[PDB]
Amino acid sequence: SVHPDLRDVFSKMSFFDKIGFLFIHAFDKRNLWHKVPVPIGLLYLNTRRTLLEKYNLLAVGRSSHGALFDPKEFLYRTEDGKYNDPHNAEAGSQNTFFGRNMEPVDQQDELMSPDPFVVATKLLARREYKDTGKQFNILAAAWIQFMVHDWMDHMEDTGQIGITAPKEVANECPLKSFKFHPTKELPTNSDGIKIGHYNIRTAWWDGSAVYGNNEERAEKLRTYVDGKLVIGDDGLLLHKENGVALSGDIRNSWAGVSILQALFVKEHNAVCDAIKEEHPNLSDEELYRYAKLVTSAVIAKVHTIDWTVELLKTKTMRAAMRANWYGLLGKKIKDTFGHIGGPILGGLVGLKKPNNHGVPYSLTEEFTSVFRMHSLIPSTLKLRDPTGQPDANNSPPCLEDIDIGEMIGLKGEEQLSKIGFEKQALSMGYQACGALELWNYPSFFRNLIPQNLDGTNRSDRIDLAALEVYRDRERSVPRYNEFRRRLFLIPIKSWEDLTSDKDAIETIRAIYGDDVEKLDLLVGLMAEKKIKGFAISETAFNIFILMASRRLEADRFFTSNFNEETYTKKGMQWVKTTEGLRDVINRHYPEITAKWMKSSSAFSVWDADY
Ligand code: HEM
Ligand SMILES: CCCCCCCCO[C@@H]1O[C@H](CO)[C@@H](O)[C@H](O)[C@H]1O
Ligand SMILES: CCCCCCCCO[C@@H]1O[C@H](CO)[C@@H](O)[C@H](O)[C@H]1O
Ligand SMILES: CCCCCCCCCCCCCCCC(=O)O
Ligand SMILES: CCCCCCCCCCCCCCCC(=O)O
Ligand SMILES: [Ca+2]
Ligand SMILES: [Cl-]
Ligand SMILES: [Cl-]
User: Fold this and answer.
1) Which residues, other chains included, contact 345 with Cβ-Cβ below 8 Å and sequence gap of 6+?
2) What binding details are noted for the cofactor?
3) Is 408 in the pocket of ligand 1 (CB under 6 A)?
């Protein structure tokens, strides 16, 4: 039968949705979807995706009456993300509402319940350091922040509020209190959801972390010759006199992200060289437009079939992510004959029309919440010598341990300037990142300098762990158990359902009591027992089934305009022949690649034996 908490929604479903639900629920009740052979696993995922697309896409703000335009007149990715969706010129652009995956839950009377500092101190603060083994390295951790920089940032109110640590835990808090800005609340003037928040980044997967979020930023980064972007002679980003990096989105960053931005600047410039060689007479503007299309597609491809495949290290997930990109008919057929069939057989990429499933494209409040993965950052970075004698392990030899707190923000840019690209990248490649588990949140995040929009330092330092828990509540995102119910997942009845870590359970009970409905989303996501091979929780993964597919399927430039006319022949060939981050690093840094990158993926610890 059907879980009691899901009986109501089940009874209201259409016959076809009832069938899909009973199929997935049969596996879920026995925790079986990830324990079956690949074909049944894929059917499960596709079925779950179809249900999420129907029940978990909610508009924020009025949907009708988008600004009028012809897509044939906009065959490029605009500086602010406008003019993608023919029916909604503003969809995916800078300064638009975050959508929702679920109806908001008002928590305005419980923003401090339980206390954010108590949560941060007792449940999140790093104790014994936990890492991912060989599965996922520090480049993988930098990569995902690099994507967040592409995707999402919430507009802030101009006023300030503050939180003070209670006496029970103050002695263990690096900060005793801190100030920050509330999330800006805007009226939707719509019949549905009444209050929304604005995304100040472009929600389209458009390489905006490299290119900028609007025309005013984008102009600052260009050489205006041959379509190219500015880069230093050391292969690192240039800096303004105030110490801020010249790149697309540089706010609240660190050295690991800066090297990826520099790498993709070189990628963009190399694409410019290649296209100009085939088409000698293109202007700077035309070359920039084509190269941005190519580089943003390379980024989406590397993320989809390389980064995600190492994050979710199972057979079913490698097949699923490759199917989203290439289709179930596979790369050879896709590359030779183009897109065949629908989203399953031919993939999301190269669909003849974009598909938003009836709801204007946006990234969502919940997508923000499940991407809060600050525990991926290790406490220290082991620097290695790119030209050292291979050690006892045949690794490059160790040079010194550096506190990763010294590699963050403006001071991090200074330290990176003394270390250089090769040493930073090699060192990050050879070290595991942190695991997404409880008690694994870096101490330097507990007394962090946050930045203004323009990248400059704020004087009010923050306890990020405490602030994150506060933000989810402030933004009306359902807490862990309700969040699961809204995704058609079986809720916990007791703490034992969540994890078998006895120490975790005892600490959770001391803070939340026996009220499973009180458990914060972030705490639940970190605590949840993980599927073998999964670096993330199943709960987070469910938001991603829907939203990662949506980033590709809703975008004209991954679908109707993913072709030679739009990208150029050479541009399309560049995307088609690039399979992962290894290919990009090999292009610009073949020496450290040949000497030290032994793993097939550049996201594995580089001496992994696969
Ligand atoms: C050392 C590196 C990092 C620093 C210094 C940093 C810092 C910050 C800061 C200061 C905020 C804003 C807090 C607020 O005002 O609400 C933030 C938000 C956020 N961060 Fe990080 N972070 C880092 C790494 C990462 C990583 C690895 C991820 C993984 C995806 C990540 C994901 C996010 C997300 C999803 C948000 C919320 C954005 C929003 O509210 O729209 N960050 N981070
Ligand atoms: C073991 C083989 C059982 C047959 C599986 C049918 C269950 C899936 O159900 C179907 O899923 C489709 C997407 O996968 C949806 O389009 C349909 O609405 C849903 O009914
Ligand atoms: C019964 C075994 C074969 C079932 C496989 C067919 C399921 C495909 O199902 C289709 O998937 C699409 C794309 O993902 C969904 O958008 C559609 O709603 C559904 O028609
Ligand atoms: C003998 C069992 C083997 C498993 C069978 C797998 C074949 C199913 C794949 C075809 C899916 C149908 C595609 C629908 C349209 C589309 O989205 O492309
Ligand atoms: C062949 C049909 C099955 C297709 C199922 C699609 C499953 C997509 C899973 C997406 C997981 C992405 C997790 C990484 C985070 C992200 O990119 O948003
Ligand atoms: Ca973007
Ligand atoms: Cl393939
Ligand atoms: Cl491709």
Assistant:
1) 327, 328, 329
2) Binds 1 heme b (iron(II)-protoporphyrin IX) group per subunit.
3) yes
